[PDB]
Motif scaffolding. Sequence first.
Motif, PDB file in Angstrom:
ATOM      1  N   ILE A 107       0.942  -1.093  -0.219  1.00 20.58           N
ATOM      2  CA  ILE A 107       0.096  -0.020  -0.099  1.00 20.58           C
ATOM      3  C   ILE A 107       0.891   1.259  -0.038  1.00 20.58           C
ATOM      4  CG2 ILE A 107      -1.522   1.526   1.679  1.00 20.58           C
ATOM      5  CD1 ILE A 107      -2.738  -1.021   2.520  1.00 20.58           C
ATOM      6  N   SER A 108       1.898   1.122   0.680  1.00 19.88           N
ATOM      7  CA  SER A 108       3.023   2.419   0.817  1.00 19.88           C
ATOM      8  C   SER A 108       3.602   2.637  -0.675  1.00 19.88           C
ATOM      9  CB  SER A 108       3.955   2.268   1.992  1.00 19.88           C
ATOM     10  OG  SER A 108       3.769   3.450   2.739  1.00 19.88           O
ATOM     11  N   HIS A 109       4.019   1.490  -1.108  1.00 16.43           N
ATOM     12  CA  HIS A 109       4.884   1.667  -2.474  1.00 16.43           C
ATOM     13  C   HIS A 109       3.853   2.315  -3.423  1.00 16.43           C
ATOM     14  CE1 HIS A 109       8.694  -0.145  -1.714  1.00 16.43           C
ATOM     15  NE2 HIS A 109       8.198  -0.755  -0.892  1.00 16.43           N
ATOM     16  N   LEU A 110       2.445   1.908  -3.376  1.00 16.75           N
ATOM     17  CA  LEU A 110       1.836   2.453  -4.197  1.00 16.75           C
ATOM     18  C   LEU A 110       1.399   4.103  -3.755  1.00 16.75           C
ATOM     19  CD1 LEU A 110      -0.781   3.098  -5.946  1.00 16.75           C
ATOM     20  CD2 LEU A 110       0.173   1.117  -6.471  1.00 16.75           C
ATOM     21  N   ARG A 111       1.563   4.284  -2.800  1.00 14.09           N
ATOM     22  CA  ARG A 111       1.463   5.824  -2.136  1.00 14.09           C
ATOM     23  C   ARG A 111       2.476   6.368  -2.649  1.00 14.09           C
ATOM     24  NH1 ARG A 111       0.690   5.826   4.100  1.00 14.09           N
ATOM     25  NH2 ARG A 111      -1.365   6.759   4.047  1.00 14.09           N
ATOM     26  N   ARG A 112       3.815   5.851  -2.740  1.00  9.13           N
ATOM     27  CA  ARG A 112       4.923   6.369  -3.274  1.00  9.13           C
ATOM     28  C   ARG A 112       4.851   6.689  -4.667  1.00  9.13           C
ATOM     29  NH1 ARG A 112      10.291   3.711  -2.666  1.00  9.13           N
ATOM     30  NH2 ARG A 112       9.185   2.148  -3.830  1.00  9.13           N
ATOM     31  N   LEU A 113       4.361   5.714  -5.442  1.00 11.85           N
ATOM     32  CA  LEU A 113       3.996   5.879  -6.876  1.00 11.85           C
ATOM     33  C   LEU A 113       3.028   7.264  -7.120  1.00 11.85           C
ATOM     34  CD1 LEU A 113       5.597   4.381  -9.070  1.00 11.85           C
ATOM     35  CD2 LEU A 113       5.351   3.144  -6.753  1.00 11.85           C
ATOM     36  N   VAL A 114       2.083   7.308  -6.337  1.00 12.75           N
ATOM     37  CA  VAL A 114       1.095   8.325  -6.545  1.00 12.75           C
ATOM     38  C   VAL A 114       1.706   9.654  -6.224  1.00 12.75           C
ATOM     39  CG1 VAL A 114      -1.117   9.483  -5.475  1.00 12.75           C
ATOM     40  CG2 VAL A 114      -0.928   6.774  -5.931  1.00 12.75           C
ATOM     41  N   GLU A 115       2.493   9.659  -4.978  1.00  9.98           N
ATOM     42  CA  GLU A 115       3.190  11.065  -4.632  1.00  9.98           C
ATOM     43  C   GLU A 115       4.311  11.329  -5.649  1.00  9.98           C
ATOM     44  OE1 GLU A 115       1.124  10.228  -3.302  1.00  9.98           O
ATOM     45  OE2 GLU A 115       1.734   8.997  -1.476  1.00  9.98           O
ATOM     46  N   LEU A 116       5.129  10.501  -6.198  1.00 10.31           N
ATOM     47  CA  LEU A 116       5.945  11.040  -7.179  1.00 10.31           C
ATOM     48  C   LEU A 116       5.037  11.265  -8.655  1.00 10.31           C
ATOM     49  CD1 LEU A 116       8.138   7.936  -6.322  1.00 10.31           C
ATOM     50  CD2 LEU A 116       8.915  10.465  -6.024  1.00 10.31           C
ATOM     51  N   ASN A 117       4.343  10.601  -8.820  1.00  9.77           N
ATOM     52  CA  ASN A 117       3.333  10.877 -10.053  1.00  9.77           C
ATOM     53  C   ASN A 117       2.574  12.362 -10.131  1.00  9.77           C
ATOM     54  OD1 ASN A 117       2.931   7.303 -10.485  1.00  9.77           O
ATOM     55  ND2 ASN A 117       4.428   8.821 -11.422  1.00  9.77           N
ATOM     56  N   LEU A 118       2.375  12.578  -8.626  1.00 10.20           N
ATOM     57  CA  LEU A 118       1.616  13.750  -8.382  1.00 10.20           C
ATOM     58  C   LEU A 118       2.434  15.066  -9.071  1.00 10.20           C
ATOM     59  CD1 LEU A 118      -0.710  14.499  -5.445  1.00 10.20           C
ATOM     60  CD2 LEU A 118       0.456  16.331  -6.508  1.00 10.20           C
ATOM     61  N   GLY A 119       3.693  15.042  -8.587  1.00 11.98           N
ATOM     62  CA  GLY A 119       4.594  16.136  -8.820  1.00 11.98           C
ATOM     63  C   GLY A 119       4.704  17.063  -7.687  1.00 11.98           C
ATOM     64  N   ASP A 120       4.086  18.180  -7.850  1.00 14.44           N
ATOM     65  CA  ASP A 120       4.153  19.325  -6.838  1.00 14.44           C
ATOM     66  C   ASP A 120       3.032  20.334  -7.110  1.00 14.44           C
ATOM     67  OD1 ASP A 120       5.892  19.725  -4.658  1.00 14.44           O
ATOM     68  OD2 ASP A 120       5.823  21.785  -5.194  1.00 14.44           O
ATOM     69  N   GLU A 121       2.902  21.315  -6.093  1.00 23.56           N
ATOM     70  CA  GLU A 121       2.002  22.425  -6.243  1.00 23.56           C
ATOM     71  C   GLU A 121       1.892  22.956  -7.791  1.00 23.56           C
ATOM     72  OE1 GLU A 121       3.072  25.452  -3.491  1.00 23.56           O
ATOM     73  OE2 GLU A 121       2.498  24.257  -1.947  1.00 23.56           O
ATOM     74  N   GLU A 122       0.683  23.067  -8.297  1.00 23.30           N
ATOM     75  CA  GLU A 122       0.460  23.594  -9.566  1.00 23.30           C
ATOM     76  C   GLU A 122      -0.632  24.742  -9.864  1.00 23.30           C
ATOM     77  OE1 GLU A 122      -0.661  19.879 -11.217  1.00 23.30           O
ATOM     78  OE2 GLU A 122      -2.273  19.880 -10.533  1.00 23.30           O
ATOM     79  N   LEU A 123      -1.038  25.009 -10.833  1.00 24.95           N
ATOM     80  CA  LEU A 123      -2.312  26.053 -11.019  1.00 24.95           C
ATOM     81  C   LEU A 123      -3.583  25.392 -11.517  1.00 24.95           C
ATOM     82  CD1 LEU A 123       0.788  26.599 -12.560  1.00 24.95           C
ATOM     83  CD2 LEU A 123       0.082  28.884 -12.101  1.00 24.95           C
ATOM     84  N   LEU A 124      -4.043  25.860 -12.632  1.00 25.74           N
ATOM     85  CA  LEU A 124      -5.220  25.362 -13.100  1.00 25.74           C
ATOM     86  C   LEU A 124      -6.373  25.389 -12.233  1.00 25.74           C
ATOM     87  CD1 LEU A 124      -3.495  22.818 -15.365  1.00 25.74           C
ATOM     88  CD2 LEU A 124      -5.445  24.281 -16.226  1.00 25.74           C
ATOM     89  N   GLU A 125      -6.097  25.758 -11.101  1.00 27.30           N
ATOM     90  CA  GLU A 125      -6.946  25.815  -9.825  1.00 27.30           C
ATOM     91  C   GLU A 125      -8.039  24.614 -10.031  1.00 27.30           C
ATOM     92  OE1 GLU A 125      -7.519  27.113  -7.203  1.00 27.30           O
ATOM     93  OE2 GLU A 125      -7.621  29.153  -7.143  1.00 27.30           O
ATOM     94  N   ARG A 126      -9.083  24.680 -10.877  1.00 25.58           N
ATOM     95  CA  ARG A 126     -10.035  23.616 -11.132  1.00 25.58           C
ATOM     96  C   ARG A 126      -9.637  22.481 -10.753  1.00 25.58           C
ATOM     97  NH1 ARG A 126     -10.072  28.827 -12.652  1.00 25.58           N
ATOM     98  NH2 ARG A 126     -11.197  29.393 -14.495  1.00 25.58           N
ATOM     99  N   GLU A 127      -8.542  21.770 -11.564  1.00 26.38           N
ATOM    100  CA  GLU A 127      -7.851  20.505 -11.267  1.00 26.38           C
ATOM    101  C   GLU A 127      -7.663  20.259  -9.888  1.00 26.38           C
ATOM    102  OE1 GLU A 127      -7.312  17.871 -12.734  1.00 26.38           O
ATOM    103  OE2 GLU A 127      -7.867  18.474 -14.810  1.00 26.38           O
ATOM    104  N   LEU A 128      -7.268  21.550  -9.169  1.00 27.54           N
ATOM    105  CA  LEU A 128      -7.027  21.239  -7.614  1.00 27.54           C
ATOM    106  C   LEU A 128      -8.209  21.071  -6.811  1.00 27.54           C
ATOM    107  CD1 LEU A 128      -4.299  21.382  -6.074  1.00 27.54           C
ATOM    108  CD2 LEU A 128      -5.278  23.358  -5.214  1.00 27.54           C
ATOM    109  N   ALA A 129      -9.353  21.876  -7.608  1.00 29.54           N
ATOM    110  CA  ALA A 129     -10.527  21.798  -6.791  1.00 29.54           C
ATOM    111  C   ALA A 129     -11.462  20.497  -6.972  1.00 29.54           C
ATOM    112  CB  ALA A 129     -11.408  23.109  -7.152  1.00 29.54           C
TER     113      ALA A 129
END
Length: 125
Positions: free
Chosen positions: A95-117
């Motif tokens: 489950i954690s390795h899957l979390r790692r994959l999700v976190e890295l794939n997420l990237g970091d703070e971004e814009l587009l607002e909507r997507e975030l909302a």
Amino acid sequence: MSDQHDERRRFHRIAFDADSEILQGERRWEVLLHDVSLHGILVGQPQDWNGDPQRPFEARLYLGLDVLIRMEISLAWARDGLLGFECQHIDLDSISHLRRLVELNLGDEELLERELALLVSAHDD
Ligand SMILES: Nc1nc2c(ncn2[C@@H]2O[C@@H]3COP(=O)(O)O[C@H]4[C@@H](O)[C@H](n5cnc6c(=O)[nH]c(N)nc65)O[C@@H]4COP(=O)(O)O[C@H]3[C@H]2O)c(=O)[nH]1
Ligand SMILES: Nc1nc2c(ncn2[C@@H]2O[C@@H]3COP(=O)(O)O[C@H]4[C@@H](O)[C@H](n5cnc6c(=O)[nH]c(N)nc65)O[C@@H]4COP(=O)(O)O[C@H]3[C@H]2O)c(=O)[nH]1
């Protein structure tokens, strides 16, 4: 048929390429994993797929050399050569390795607002 692609799975699924193997009973087969989620997996249907859709299946994913993940899944659906699977149970470590994959794939703070909302329509508010 436009930018809705008829979405039915709350949120997308971390899609990445890698090698996956599925074991059901005393039978094992090699398959390519097209995408996964924190509670679901998609794979390709191999010819030697000699298994009963009614009986459960087990999936093992191989990413890093020291990264071996194990999840227990059941057949959810099958269409156009591809096969879907819903996660019934997965190792705490996996489950954690899957979390790692999700976190890295997420990237970091971004814009587009909507997507975030968009997270709003699902969980965490
Ligand atoms: N029963 C079932 N079948 C599943 C499931 N997940 C995938 N499939 C099947 O596997 C196909 C893989 O998607 P795609 O066509 O490559 O590509 C998809 C994808 O890019 C997009 N799409 C559709 N629904 C969603 C969604 O809820 N979320 C996201 N992120 N994309 C979606 O639209 C395309 C067309 O979707 P389909 O024609 O349905 O094509 C789906 C569908 O036939 C599932 O949970 N249950
Ligand atoms: N990562 C990943 N997980 C998968 C996949 N196939 C199934 N699952 C998991 O198992 C569930 C399948 O539900 P369903 O009864 O087939 O019913 C599906 C189906 O009716 C629809 N759906 C979702 N995504 C698609 C899609 O891409 N195409 C089509 N045609 N229907 C979809 O929404 C429902 C979602 O059900 P849930 O249990 O909430 O969400 C998904 C998900 O948790 C897959 O390819 N990848």
